[PDB]
Amino acid sequence: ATCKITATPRQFQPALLSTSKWIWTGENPIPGGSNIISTRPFRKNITAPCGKCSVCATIVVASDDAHTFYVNGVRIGTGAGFRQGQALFVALQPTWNLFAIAGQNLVANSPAGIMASILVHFSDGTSETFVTDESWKTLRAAPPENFQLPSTNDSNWPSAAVQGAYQNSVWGPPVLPPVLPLRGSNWIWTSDNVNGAAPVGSRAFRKTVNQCTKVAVCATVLIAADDRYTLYVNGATVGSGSSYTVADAYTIPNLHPTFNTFAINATNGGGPAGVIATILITYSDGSNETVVTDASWKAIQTIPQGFQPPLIDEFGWESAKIIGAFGVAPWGAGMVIPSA
């Protein structure tokens, strides 16, 4: 039923909308034509290719006018708008997954459509993108009670009707959102960072997530530092960077189910210093949680040997100091963030 996960941490791979289609019901046989104010269901049971297990997914979804996105009966997000997609992350069942979307047209005589890409990551480190298209099922009626549940049978539902393609539609191509926000996160450092500068040298930072009653699956990490950083998860090297204007994103497909420690060695070459990160963890029940760099991280000025292992004694580590919320001078708000 389950597969061994041989996937290991890697550079984050953006889900793209380029191959996706806009879908609606076809109540107006003109694609992109005038549609009535209405809410409509869309469903697709997506099976895993034989020989591997699905682990988690990066989702980008756009809508005219609004949407609610469900995975295996669990509401994962609500959003609206076709100028920019919405990023969502979710843990998956190993062999099949039911994706369901309630799409909503809010404006009379206006076009209606939903578009999504679902980039599924498999237990062996491969991935595959699935899209909204005419293989999805819909109804010419409001979403029935529990339409998003696997217990609902859609075998007799009609096929969704394609309203347009990524590069040929009334909507034009939605821009991808950032993989994760840095808004809501903080530049942190050790407490020797004062008056807008820190000493030259390397500093370590640690954050543990341990929800012992849940099952963690995948993490996505967005990180940048002035001047540079090396990132570890459970003692394993994830990646390194040396830019405070271009952030790096990583996928961790092989989290421990209950206890995970993120550790950073960040180095200041002189002058202002800080490290900032946003981390989203997916859980097997469809929930998630976000961790940001803030004062709940532990920090130390002289880095000990083994600073990155998960179960070290954190005696003598201090609370990290918040230098500023994302946006403050001198770094500003212009960080280049990878697309979701």
Binding residues for Ca(2+): 64-65, 105, 110-111, 226-227, 268, 270, 272
Cα–Cα separations (whole angstroms), residue 177 to 61, 88, 112, 115, 332 = 10, 10, 21, 14, 19
Q: Which of 13, 28, 38, 45 binds ligand NAG (CB under 6 A)?
A: 45
Q: Give me the 185-224 binding string for its own copies, x by CB under 8 A, dash otherwise.
A: -------------------------xxx------------
Token representation of residue 11: 């550079």
Q: Which of 23, 61, 88, 98 binds ligand NAG (CB under 6 A)?
A: 98
**Minimum Å distance from CB 218 to ligand NAG?**
21
* Token pair listed for 91: 């843990």
Q: What are the two backbone dihedrals, phi and then psi, of residue 259, each rounded to the nearest 5 degrees?
A: -140, 120
Query: Do you know the residue count of the chain?
Result: 340
Number of residues that bind its own copies (CB under 8 A): 17
Q: Which of 13, 38, 78, 110 binds Ca ion (CB under 5 A)?
A: 110
> Per-residue contact track with its own copies, 250 to 289, x per CB under 8 A?
----x-x-xx------------------------------
Which entry of Ca ion, its own copies, ligand NAG, none binds 65, CB below 5 to 8 A by partner kind?
Ca ion
Close Cβ partners of 71 (under 8 Å, ≥ 6 residues apart):
57, 90, 92, 97, 98, 99, 100, 286
Degrees to nearest 5, angle at CA 168 with 162 and 172: 105
Q: How far is the CB of 269 from its own copies (least distance, A)?
A: 32
Query: Is 200 a binder of Ca ion (CB under 5 A)?
Result: no
Q: d(Cα 287, Cα 179) in Å, to the nearest integer?
A: 18
Work out how close the CB of 48 gets to ligand NAG at its nearest, in angstroms, rounded to a whole number: 7
Residue 44 or 203 having the CB closest to Ca ion: 203
Bridge partners (DSSP) listed for residue 282: 288
At its nearest, how many Å lie between Ca ion and the CB of residue 107? Answer: 5
CB 299 within 8 A of CB 205: yes
- Based on its alpha-carbon atoms, the radius of gyration of the chain, rounded to whole angstroms, reads 22
Is residue 308 part of the contact set for its own copies (CB under 8 A)? no
Binding flag, residue 310, its own copies (CB under 8 A): yes
In the complex, the smallest distance separating the C-beta of residue 40 from ligand NAG, rounded to whole angstroms, is 19
CB 187 within 8 A of CB 323: yes
Among 150, 177, 286, 310, binds ligand NAG (CB under 6 A): 150
Q: Which residue is nearest to Ca ion (CB)?
A: 110
Which residue's structure tokens are 């040298």? 201
- Cβ contact 166:31 at 8 Å: no
Q: Does 2 bind ligand NAG (CB under 6 A)?
A: no
Annotated binding site for N-acetyl-D-galactosamine: 270
CB atoms within 10 A of CB 29: 7
Residue whose C-alpha is closest to residue 7's, from 94, 127, 129: 127
Residues of this chain, 241-300, that bind Ca ion according to CB under 5 A? 268, 271, 273
Handedness of CA 19, 22, 27, 32 (dihedral sign): negative
Do residues 305 and 313 lie in contact, with contact meaning Cβ atoms separated by under 8 Å? no
The nearer residue to ligand NAG, 2 or 47, going by C-beta atoms, is 47
Q: Interface with ligand NAG includes 286 (CB under 6 A)?
A: no
Which CB sits closer to Ca ion, 129 or 268? 268
Residues that bind its own copies (CB under 8 A): 2, 4-5, 210-212, 234-235, 254, 256, 258-259, 310-311, 313, 315-316
